[PDB]
Design a protein around this ligand. Structure first.
Ligand SMILES: [Zn+2]
Lengths: 74, 121, 327, 53
RNA sequence: GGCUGCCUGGGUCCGCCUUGAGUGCCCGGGUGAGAAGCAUGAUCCCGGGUAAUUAUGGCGGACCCACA
RNA sequence: AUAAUUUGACUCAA
């Protein structure tokens, strides 16, 4: 697995915003530090060096993942 | 002061013009809204045109003054647009209003008509 | 604060003594009022409402032209600067389609964020970005990479942000604005927009609304005075300023107009900064656009040697009976 | 419409007064236009007097 | 060889490589008000409107082959 | 005719 960084906030539209440094692709698996499923990638945007990533949550509570570290399952 | 205004309006006369519409609303009939106003002019239906001094952009009403001298109609300017609407009886503003039926305001209208003659030529 | 179109080059001299003959050819000043329309571009102030495509057609009919174009698609709600190609100068759009752009944008935010954090994020959106054109687009839906030059913050009023912004061609404002809203959290949409710059086109006195456009046209058509309608349209050389130019001698004009490629022994003066593959504008000494084409050499190779092909002449605009044959 | 502009300095704002120089502010968006332009004849007559024709 | 006229590769300009009808939207004409946005047009009917360029293959035509 | 491009288009039929 590879690391992204710290979670910023959950948008009301349905996205968890993470601040990462590398370029991911469409429909990636997202897990936390203990290899448990969190969500799926839907939109990548922002600057070249440090892009933001918006996540579609396939879990019951995305309100407790505020101030967390999220990964990508490899 | 904007370029479509061809002559100065004494502050009392503008109030007199407002007094016309206010009363006209209840006793006669009126045309509220630039598009409507213009329609009221070309069909010769109008009797007095009342344009605001604070219209932006200039192009929306510009055509009225020359169209008024075309079909002989006397026309007048008034300070506010926000004030014109309230006197015409609406929430928002009107840029230009025209009166068809003077109602009781007959004499008040006919007097405004004569004081605009001298302010022209 | 500036664009790649802003960067001013410099005229270099391979030949100082090559002079121009005033009797052949017609400059922007001495073009007959009919000719100026054929080889003319309108610097238009587009009002909101219609699509840019519909704008073309009205001008087509009112002024009675059979071919017309534009420097990109601006949206119905959007307003501002639009270059308008006419008649022969219709194809000159290919130089303005990739050129740098600038808009003034208003952006509503759905929540509350203290003022100073916004500029910190507004600074951060300066560089390369990743975007996907929305469902409502004229190009293919693929993940390209567009360039952003600068975002200077105008003013703020709590939930609404006024800001000046200039970008590369094809870059989506709505896509960006939405993404900046997600960079702050609460999200964002665009309620209003206006263009301010497009290549070498900005809000000046040559800029004109559709009202004044048609007004001035009938003033020459019905009343017959040329001065007003003249400044309404611009010589097609205006849509060339942001491109590298090459000044060619009187003898090098006629040959090229017959489809010929420009050789080095035909060059008198040239702009600095030319590479192989770049489009270079071909100009007479009186500043008239002759043709467009790709360079075969650099600014050094055209300057030093005396033998070879310098510019592959691709698109001809200047007529043939302007300058007589001297090859 | 809300985007305004100064007819003197060239500054965009949201207020009524120029928050900079102090002039009256007007709407930036150009007048709405019709392919028919109904009363164009009359608008030209007003433009004649101002321009002096 | 130089030149004209028929001949034809390359370059360049102009044409052509579907037109109907429907959605969204826009604009005109007609009409003229209680979300509040909106008289700088709510609603309802009728009419009309929806551009260009590049690269390559095919086709009809117009010039010319030019290191100036 | 095919594929792209411009911040604005999508569905269908001989
Ligand atoms: Zn000011």
């Amino acid at each position: 697995m590879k690391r992204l960084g710290k979670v910023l906030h959950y948008a009301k539209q349905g996205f968890l915003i993470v601040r990462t440094n590398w370029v991911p692709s469409l429909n990636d698996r997202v897990v936390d530090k203990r290899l448990q499923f969190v969500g799926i990638v839907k939109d990548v945007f922002g600057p070249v060096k440090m892009p933001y990533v918006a996540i579609k949550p396939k879990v019951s509570n995305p309100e407790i993942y505020v101030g967390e570290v999220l990964y990508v399952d490899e | 002061k904007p370029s479509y205004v061809k002559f100065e309006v004494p502050k009392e006369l503008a109030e007199k013009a407002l007094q016309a519409v206010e009363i006209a609303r209840d006793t006669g009939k009126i045309r509220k809204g630039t598009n409507e106003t213009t329609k009221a002019v070309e069909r010769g239906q109008a009797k007095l045109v009342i344009i605001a001094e604070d219209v932006d952009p200039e192009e929306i009403v510009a055509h009225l003054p020359p169209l008024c001298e075309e079909k002989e109609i006397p026309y007048i300017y008034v300070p506010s647009k926000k004030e014109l609407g309230a006197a015409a009886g609406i929430e928002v503003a009107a840029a230009s209003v025209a009166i068809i039926e003077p109602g009781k305001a007959r004499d008040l209208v006919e007097e405004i008509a004569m004081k605009v003659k001298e302010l022209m030529k | 604060r500036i664009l790649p179109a802003d960067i001013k080059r410099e005229v270099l001299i391979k030949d100082e003594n090559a002079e121009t003959n005033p009797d052949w050819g017609f400059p922007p000043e001495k073009r007959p009022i009919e000719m100026h329309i054929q080889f003319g571009v309108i610097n238009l102030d587009k009002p909101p409402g219609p699509t840019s495509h519909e704008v073309v057609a009205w001008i087509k009919k009112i002024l009675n032209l059979e071919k017309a174009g534009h420097g990109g698609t601006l949206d119905p709600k959007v307003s501002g600067v639009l270059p308008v190609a006419l008649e022969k100068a219709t194809r000159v759009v290919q130089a303005l389609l990739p050129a740098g752009k600038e808009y003034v944008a208003l952006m509503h935010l759905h929540g509350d964020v203290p003022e100073d954090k916004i500029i910190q994020v507004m600074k951060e959106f300066e560089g390369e970005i990743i975007q996907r054109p929305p469902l409502r687009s004229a190009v293919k839906r693929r993940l390209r990479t567009r360039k952003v030059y600068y975002i200077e913050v105008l003013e703020i009023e709590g939930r609404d942000v006024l800001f000046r912004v200039g970008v590369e061609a094809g870059t989506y404002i709505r896509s960006l604005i939405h993404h900046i809203g997600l960079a702050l959290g609460v999200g964002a949409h665009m309620s209003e927009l206006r263009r301010t710059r497009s290549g070498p086109f900005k809000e000046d006195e040559t800029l004109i609304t559709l009202h004044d456009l048609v007004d001035y046209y009938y003033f020459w058509k019905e009343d017959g005075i040329e001065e007003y309608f003249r400044k309404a349209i611009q010589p097609m050389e205006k849509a060339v300023e942001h491109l590298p130019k090459v000044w060619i001698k009187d003898s090098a004009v006629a040959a090229v107009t017959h489809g010929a490629d420009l050789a080095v022994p035909g060059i008198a003066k040239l702009h600095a900064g030319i590479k192989r593959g770049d489009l270079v504008a071909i100009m007479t000494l009186k500043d008239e656009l002759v043709a467009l084409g790709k360079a075969m050499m650099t600014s050094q190779e055209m300057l030093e040697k005396t033998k070879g092909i310098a510019v592959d002449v691709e698109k001809v605009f200047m007529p043939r009976d302007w300058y007589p044959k001297l090859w | 419409f809300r985007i305004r502009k100064c007819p003197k300095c060239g500054r965009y704002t949201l207020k009524e007064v120029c928050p900079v120089c102090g002039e009256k502010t007007k709407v930036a968006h150009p007048p709405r236009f019709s392919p028919e332009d109904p009363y164009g004849e009359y608008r030209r007559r007003w433009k004649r007097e101002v321009l002096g024709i």
